[PDB]
Design a protein around this ligand. Structure first.
Ligand code: NA
Length: 141
């Protein structure tokens, strides 16, 4: 399936690397919408996580490290998977990559949140949305 990954390697390549948070907007209110309490969202909002995006064949891994978590997800694009989030939600996740945007949808208890990533001027721009609450986080590598 080497030959089967020609277009795959092209679309995933811009996302690969060890990204570090440089700026954040409205992340506390986004976390509030997820159901995280004030201490957790206030303290987590102050740190700068490292997000490592890698691939092994067709399997993508995204690792998130901070003072408060060390979590990772491994998945194939477009294939739903079970995920236990850092804030202890048990969700159904599907991650796709179209038009240069990696879109991660999490579904649980009839609720939904979307995490969209794109590369703009070599930076990774991450948009987190839940019920019309939007947070934007920018990372550099
Ligand atoms: Na954190």
């Amino acid at each position: 399936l080497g030959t089967e990954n020609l277009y795959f390697q092209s679309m995933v390549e811009p996302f690969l690397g060890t990204w570090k948070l440089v700026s954040s907007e409205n992340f506390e209110d986004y976390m509030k919408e997820l159901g995280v309490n004030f201490a957790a969202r206030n303290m987590a909002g102050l740190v700068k996580p490292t997000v490592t995006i890698s691939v092994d064949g067709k399997m993508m891994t995204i690792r998130t490290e901070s003072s408060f978590q060390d979590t990772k997800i491994s998945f194939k694009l477009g294939e739903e998977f079970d995920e236990t989030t850092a804030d202890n939600r048990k969700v159904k996740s599907t991650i796709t990559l179209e038009n240069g945007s990696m879109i991660h949808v999490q579904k649980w208890l009839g609720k939904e949140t979307t995490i969209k990533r794109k590369i703009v001027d070599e930076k990774m721009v991450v948009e987190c949305k839940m019920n019309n609450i939007v947070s934007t986080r920018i990372y550099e590598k």
